[PDB]
Design an enzyme around this catalytic site. Structure first.
Site, PDB file in Angstrom:
ATOM      1  N   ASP A  68     -27.532   8.237  12.072  1.00 47.30           N
ATOM      2  CA  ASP A  68     -27.400   7.175  13.219  1.00 47.30           C
ATOM      3  C   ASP A  68     -27.596   5.806  12.460  1.00 47.30           C
ATOM      4  O   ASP A  68     -28.642   5.183  12.485  1.00 47.30           O
ATOM      5  CB  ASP A  68     -28.400   7.454  14.267  1.00 47.30           C
ATOM      6  CG  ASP A  68     -28.172   6.617  15.531  1.00 47.30           C
ATOM      7  OD1 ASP A  68     -27.221   5.869  15.425  1.00 47.30           O
ATOM      8  OD2 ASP A  68     -29.005   6.726  16.419  1.00 47.30           O
ATOM      9  N   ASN A 114     -21.157  11.310  -0.603  1.00 46.09           N
ATOM     10  CA  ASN A 114     -20.749  10.133   0.183  1.00 46.09           C
ATOM     11  C   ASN A 114     -20.821   8.919  -0.669  1.00 46.09           C
ATOM     12  O   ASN A 114     -21.696   8.654  -1.509  1.00 46.09           O
ATOM     13  CB  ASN A 114     -21.532  10.001   1.479  1.00 46.09           C
ATOM     14  CG  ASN A 114     -22.769   9.208   1.318  1.00 46.09           C
ATOM     15  OD1 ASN A 114     -22.814   7.981   1.361  1.00 46.09           O
ATOM     16  ND2 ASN A 114     -23.883   9.954   0.964  1.00 46.09           N
ATOM     17  N   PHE A 118     -22.870   1.293   2.894  1.00 45.45           N
ATOM     18  CA  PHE A 118     -23.572   0.494   3.906  1.00 45.45           C
ATOM     19  C   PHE A 118     -22.577  -0.084   4.926  1.00 45.45           C
ATOM     20  O   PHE A 118     -22.683  -1.297   5.280  1.00 45.45           O
ATOM     21  CB  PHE A 118     -24.455  -0.605   3.353  1.00 45.45           C
ATOM     22  CG  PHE A 118     -25.728  -0.216   2.639  1.00 45.45           C
ATOM     23  CD1 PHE A 118     -26.468   0.892   2.934  1.00 45.45           C
ATOM     24  CD2 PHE A 118     -26.336  -1.144   1.813  1.00 45.45           C
ATOM     25  CE1 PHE A 118     -27.618   1.200   2.271  1.00 45.45           C
ATOM     26  CE2 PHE A 118     -27.569  -0.879   1.161  1.00 45.45           C
ATOM     27  CZ  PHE A 118     -28.191   0.341   1.410  1.00 45.45           C
ATOM     28  N   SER A 184     -29.842   3.384  -2.434  1.00 46.26           N
ATOM     29  CA  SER A 184     -28.437   3.775  -2.291  1.00 46.26           C
ATOM     30  C   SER A 184     -27.719   3.732  -3.635  1.00 46.26           C
ATOM     31  O   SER A 184     -27.801   2.752  -4.389  1.00 46.26           O
ATOM     32  CB  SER A 184     -27.769   2.804  -1.309  1.00 46.26           C
ATOM     33  OG  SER A 184     -26.397   3.127  -1.302  1.00 46.26           O
ATOM     34  N   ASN A 186     -24.584   3.457  -3.739  1.00 46.82           N
ATOM     35  CA  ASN A 186     -23.253   2.957  -3.350  1.00 46.82           C
ATOM     36  C   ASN A 186     -23.200   1.454  -3.123  1.00 46.82           C
ATOM     37  O   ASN A 186     -22.161   1.009  -2.637  1.00 46.82           O
ATOM     38  CB  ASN A 186     -22.767   3.722  -2.100  1.00 46.82           C
ATOM     39  CG  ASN A 186     -22.763   5.190  -2.335  1.00 46.82           C
ATOM     40  OD1 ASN A 186     -22.284   5.615  -3.435  1.00 46.82           O
ATOM     41  ND2 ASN A 186     -23.237   5.994  -1.365  1.00 46.82           N
ATOM     42  N   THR A 187     -24.212   0.722  -3.615  1.00 49.62           N
ATOM     43  CA  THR A 187     -24.163  -0.782  -3.568  1.00 49.62           C
ATOM     44  C   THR A 187     -24.562  -1.193  -4.972  1.00 49.62           C
ATOM     45  O   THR A 187     -25.604  -0.816  -5.460  1.00 49.62           O
ATOM     46  CB  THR A 187     -25.074  -1.389  -2.468  1.00 49.62           C
ATOM     47  OG1 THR A 187     -24.557  -0.979  -1.196  1.00 49.62           O
ATOM     48  CG2 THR A 187     -25.130  -2.906  -2.511  1.00 49.62           C
ATOM     49  N   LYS A 224     -38.002   3.707  -0.017  1.00 47.27           N
ATOM     50  CA  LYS A 224     -37.188   4.900  -0.273  1.00 47.27           C
ATOM     51  C   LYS A 224     -36.606   4.852  -1.644  1.00 47.27           C
ATOM     52  O   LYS A 224     -35.943   3.892  -1.991  1.00 47.27           O
ATOM     53  CB  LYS A 224     -36.109   5.064   0.779  1.00 47.27           C
ATOM     54  CG  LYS A 224     -35.360   6.367   0.652  1.00 47.27           C
ATOM     55  CD  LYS A 224     -34.477   6.620   1.863  1.00 47.27           C
ATOM     56  CE  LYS A 224     -33.681   7.908   1.789  1.00 47.27           C
ATOM     57  NZ  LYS A 224     -32.897   8.138   3.014  1.00 47.27           N
ATOM     58  N   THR A 252     -36.394  11.938  -1.207  1.00 53.86           N
ATOM     59  CA  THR A 252     -35.542  11.029  -1.942  1.00 53.86           C
ATOM     60  C   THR A 252     -34.243  10.699  -1.205  1.00 53.86           C
ATOM     61  O   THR A 252     -33.859  11.458  -0.302  1.00 53.86           O
ATOM     62  CB  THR A 252     -35.081  11.525  -3.365  1.00 53.86           C
ATOM     63  OG1 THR A 252     -34.269  12.666  -3.194  1.00 53.86           O
ATOM     64  CG2 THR A 252     -36.293  11.974  -4.188  1.00 53.86           C
ATOM     65  N   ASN A 253     -33.593   9.681  -1.706  1.00 53.01           N
ATOM     66  CA  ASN A 253     -32.152   9.403  -1.421  1.00 53.01           C
ATOM     67  C   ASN A 253     -31.276  10.470  -2.123  1.00 53.01           C
ATOM     68  O   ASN A 253     -31.744  11.422  -2.780  1.00 53.01           O
ATOM     69  CB  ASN A 253     -31.791   7.952  -1.849  1.00 53.01           C
ATOM     70  CG  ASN A 253     -30.811   7.317  -0.907  1.00 53.01           C
ATOM     71  OD1 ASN A 253     -29.749   7.925  -0.564  1.00 53.01           O
ATOM     72  ND2 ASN A 253     -31.152   6.088  -0.445  1.00 53.01           N
TER      73      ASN A 253
HETATM   74  C1  LIG Z   1     -23.274  10.602   4.838  1.00 51.96           C
HETATM   75  C2  LIG Z   1     -24.607  10.077   4.411  1.00 51.96           C
HETATM   76  C3  LIG Z   1     -25.017   8.821   4.596  1.00 51.96           C
HETATM   77  C4  LIG Z   1     -26.251   8.315   4.249  1.00 51.96           C
HETATM   78  N1  LIG Z   1     -26.593   6.997   4.488  1.00 51.96           N
HETATM   79  C5  LIG Z   1     -27.856   6.581   4.207  1.00 51.96           C
HETATM   80  C6  LIG Z   1     -28.386   5.283   4.480  1.00 51.96           C
HETATM   81  O1  LIG Z   1     -27.595   4.450   5.137  1.00 51.96           O
HETATM   82  N2  LIG Z   1     -29.596   4.949   4.139  1.00 51.96           N
HETATM   83  C7  LIG Z   1     -30.515   5.812   3.473  1.00 51.96           C
HETATM   84  O2  LIG Z   1     -31.604   5.369   3.152  1.00 51.96           O
HETATM   85  N3  LIG Z   1     -30.087   7.032   3.225  1.00 51.96           N
HETATM   86  C8  LIG Z   1     -28.875   7.411   3.524  1.00 51.96           C
HETATM   87  N4  LIG Z   1     -28.445   8.665   3.262  1.00 51.96           N
HETATM   88  C9  LIG Z   1     -29.382   9.630   2.557  1.00 51.96           C
HETATM   89  C10 LIG Z   1     -30.182  10.545   3.457  1.00 51.96           C
HETATM   90  O3  LIG Z   1     -31.055   9.805   4.292  1.00 51.96           O
HETATM   91  C11 LIG Z   1     -31.050  11.569   2.685  1.00 51.96           C
HETATM   92  O4  LIG Z   1     -31.954  10.787   1.869  1.00 51.96           O
HETATM   93  C12 LIG Z   1     -30.175  12.450   1.767  1.00 51.96           C
HETATM   94  O5  LIG Z   1     -28.894  12.764   2.290  1.00 51.96           O
HETATM   95  C13 LIG Z   1     -30.928  13.759   1.386  1.00 51.96           C
HETATM   96  O6  LIG Z   1     -31.164  14.573   2.547  1.00 51.96           O
HETATM   97  P1  LIG Z   1     -30.191  15.774   2.974  1.00 51.96           P
HETATM   98  O7  LIG Z   1     -29.961  16.633   1.730  1.00 51.96           O
HETATM   99  O8  LIG Z   1     -30.980  16.486   4.018  1.00 51.96           O
HETATM  100  O9  LIG Z   1     -28.900  15.167   3.468  1.00 51.96           O
HETATM  101  C14 LIG Z   1     -27.230   9.216   3.641  1.00 51.96           C
HETATM  102  C15 LIG Z   1     -26.809  10.528   3.431  1.00 51.96           C
HETATM  103  C16 LIG Z   1     -25.538  10.977   3.829  1.00 51.96           C
HETATM  104  C17 LIG Z   1     -25.228  12.442   3.586  1.00 51.96           C
HETATM  105  O1  LIG Z   2     -23.262   4.724   1.088  1.00 54.84           O
HETATM  106  C1  LIG Z   2     -24.153   4.637   1.996  1.00 54.84           C
HETATM  107  O2  LIG Z   2     -24.085   3.848   2.948  1.00 54.84           O
HETATM  108  C2  LIG Z   2     -25.431   5.434   1.769  1.00 54.84           C
HETATM  109  C3  LIG Z   2     -25.278   6.648   1.099  1.00 54.84           C
HETATM  110  C4  LIG Z   2     -26.379   7.228   0.577  1.00 54.84           C
HETATM  111  O3  LIG Z   2     -26.180   8.356   0.063  1.00 54.84           O
HETATM  112  N1  LIG Z   2     -27.561   6.610   0.573  1.00 54.84           N
HETATM  113  C5  LIG Z   2     -27.749   5.366   1.146  1.00 54.84           C
HETATM  114  O4  LIG Z   2     -28.900   4.845   1.025  1.00 54.84           O
HETATM  115  N2  LIG Z   2     -26.542   4.695   1.595  1.00 54.84           N
END
Ligand SMILES: Cc1cc2nc3c(=O)[nH]c(=O)nc-3n(C[C@H](O)[C@H](O)[C@H](O)COP(=O)(O)O)c2cc1C
Ligand SMILES: O=C(O)c1cc(=O)[nH]c(=O)[nH]1
Ligand SMILES: COC(=O)/C(CN)=C1\SCC(=O)N1c1ccc(Br)cc1
Length: 364
Positions: A68, A114, A118, A184, A186-187, A224, A252-253
Site C-alpha cells: 500500500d 522489482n 518510488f 531501496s 532502486n534510487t 530500514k 531487511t529491504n
Molecule cells: C513490489 C515491491 C515493492 C516494494 N516497495 C517498497 C517500498 O516502497 N519501501 C520499502 O521500504 N520497502 C519496499 N519493499 C520491500 C518490502 O517492504 C520488504 O522489505 C521486502 O520485500 C522483503 O519482504 P518479503 O520477502 O516478505 O517481500 C517492496 C517490496 C516489493 C516486493
Molecule cells: O522500487 C521501489 O519503489 C522499492 C523497491 C524495493 O524493493 N524497496 C524499496 O524500498 N523501494
C-alpha cells in the site's frame, strides 16, 4: 484450511496466468480497499500480543512497505488480519517511478524482483487520505492495531535529509511510527545514506524534526536497512542508532544479490529480490543487528516470511515483530492467518508463554 488450498492452488495461479504482476498488484490493492477478502477466521490469542515502540500490537504480523504505497488499502489490510500496517514509501512530490515493466515474478523460486523506483502519489495526497480516517486510526491504534509510514526521497532531490524532514513534518503526526527508508536499491545513491557520516547527519535532522511535533502526534522513528551491508556498515549503523536513540530498525529491504540457485527465467532482471531466497539472509542480518545493539533496540524482521516457522525464526533471532509482502503474491490473503496459527502452535511446542518470551531466545 479450504481457503488456504483454494487460494494457493487455484485463485492465485489463475491471477498470475492472466495478469502481469503490476496489474495484478493494482487489482489486489483495489480488492483489499473494498474489503473483498476471504473470512479471516483466526482469532488473535493473547499469546500473540506484543508491546513495543510505545504501543500494543494485537499480533506481530504486519504488511511490509510497498504493498500500500499510497495509503489506499489500510482498513482492508487490518481486515486481512495484519496486526499492524505500514504504508509507503511516500516521496515529497508525486513521481511516476521507473518505466514499465518494472516488476517480475520468479515462481520457481517463490520470489519477486522489482525496480518500481518510488512511484508515489506524494506527501500531500497521502496526508489528505490519512486525515480522512485519522480518528478511525486512533481507535484502531488504541485497540492494538497501529499504523507505520515509510518515507522516501524524490529522484531529483538535491538534499536527501530535507526530503525526509519534510516527510516527518507532513506525515509524522498521522503515524504511530515512521520509517527512514535508506535501503531501496532502486534510487541512485540512496543506499550510500547508510554510511556512518551520512546516516548520523541525516538521522540527527530527522530526530530533531520529530521531537518538534506535539506530544500526542510524535511517532517512533525506525531506520530500514539493506540485507547487502558489509560488516563495517552494520557496525556503523548500530553505533549511530545507539548514539542518537533511534527507536528501532526494520531488517531487511530487498537484496541486490542473486543467490546461487535461482531458477526463474527473470533472475537477471535489475532490481531488488524478495521472497524465499532472501529469507535467511534477512534472518542473519536480524541476528547480527540484535547482537550489535545488545538486544536494546526493537527490530521489525522482514524478508521471505511465508510460514509460522519463518516468523518464529526471525523472532528468535531478535525480531519483536515481523512483516511480509511477497508471500501474498503466491499464497494470497489466507497466508496471514496461516502464519499466525502456525506461530501460536510453535510457540506452545517450544515452551514459550507468548511471542514476547521468544524475542531474541537464540542469543540466550
Ligand atoms: C513490489 C515491491 C515493492 C516494494 N516497495 C517498497 C517500498 O516502497 N519501501 C520499502 O521500504 N520497502 C519496499 N519493499 C520491500 C518490502 O517492504 C520488504 O522489505 C521486502 O520485500 C522483503 O519482504 P518479503 O520477502 O516478505 O517481500 C517492496 C517490496 C516489493 C516486493
Ligand atoms: O522500487 C521501489 O519503489 C522499492 C523497491 C524495493 O524493493 N524497496 C524499496 O524500498 N523501494
Ligand atoms: C480477480 O481478483 C480477485 O478475485 C482477487 C484479487 N486480487 C481476490 S478474490 C478474493 C480476494 O481475496 N482477492 C484478493 C485480494 C487481495 C489479494 Br493480496 C489477493 C487476492
Amino acid at each position: 484450511t479450504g481457503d488456504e488450498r483454494f487460494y494457493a492452488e487455484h485463485l492465485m495461479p489463475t491471477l498470475q496466468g492472466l495478469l502481469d504482476p503490476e496489474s495484478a498488484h493494482r487489482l489486489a490493492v483495489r480488492f483489499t480497499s473494498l474489503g473483498l477478502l476471504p473470512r479471516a477466521r483466526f482469532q488473535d490469542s493473547d499469546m500473540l500480543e506484543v508491546r513495543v515502540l510505545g504501543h500494543k500490537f494485537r499480533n506481530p504480523v504486519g504488511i511490509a512497505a510497498g504493498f500500500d504505497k499510497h495509503g489506499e488499502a489500510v482498513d482492508g489490510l487490518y481486515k486481512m488480519g495484519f496486526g499492524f500496517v505500514e504504508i509507503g514509501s511516500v516521496t515529497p512530490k508525486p513521481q511516476e517511478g521507473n518505466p514499465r515493466p518494472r516488476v517480475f515474478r520468479l515462481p520457481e523460486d517463490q520470489a519477486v524482483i522489482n525496480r518500481y523506483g518510488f512511484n508515489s502519489h506524494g506527501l500531500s495526497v497521502v496526508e489528505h487520505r490519512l486525515r480522512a480516517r485519522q480518528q478511525k486510526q486512533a481507535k484502531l491504534t488504541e485497540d492494538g492495531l497501529p499504523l507505520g509510514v515509510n518515507l522516501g526521497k524524490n529522484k531529483t532531490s538535491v538534499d536527501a535529509a530535507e526530503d525526509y524532514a519534510e516527510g516527518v513534518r507532513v506525515l509524522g503526526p498521522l503515524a504511530d511510527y515512521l520509517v527512514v527508508n535508506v535501503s531501496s536499491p532502486n534510487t541512485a545513491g540512496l543506499r550510500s545514506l547508510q554510511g556512518k557520516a551520512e546516516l548520523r547527519r541525516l538521522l540527527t535532522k530527522v530526530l530533531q524534526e520529530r521531537d518538534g511535533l506535539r506530544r500526542v502526534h510524535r511517532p517512533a522513528v525506525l531506520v530500514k536497512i539493506a540485507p547487502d551491508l558489509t560488516s563495517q556498515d552494520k557496525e556503523d549503523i548500530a553505533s549511530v542508532v545507539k548514539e542518537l536513540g533511534i527507536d528501532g530498525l526494520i531488517v531487511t529491504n530487498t537484496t541486490v544479490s542473486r543467490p546461487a540457485g535461482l531458477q526463474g527465467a527473470l533472475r537477471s532482471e535489475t532490481g531488488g529480490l524478495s521472497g524465499k531466497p532472501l529469507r535467511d539472509l534477512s534472518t542473519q542480518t536480524i541476528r547480527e543487528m540484535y547482537a550489535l545493539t545488545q538486544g536494546r533496540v526493537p527490530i521489525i524482521g522482514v524478508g521471505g516470511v511465508s510460514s509460522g516457522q519463518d516468523a518464529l525464526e526471525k523472532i528468535r533471532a531478535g525480531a519483536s515483530l515481523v512483516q511480509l509482502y511477497t508471500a501474498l503474491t503466491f499464497w494470497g490473503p489466507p497466508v496471514v492467518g496461516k502464519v499466525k496459527r502456525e506461530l501460536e502452535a510453535l510457540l506452545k511446542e517450544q515452551g514459550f508463554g507468548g511471542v514476547t518470551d521468544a524475542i531474541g531466545a537464540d542469543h540466550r
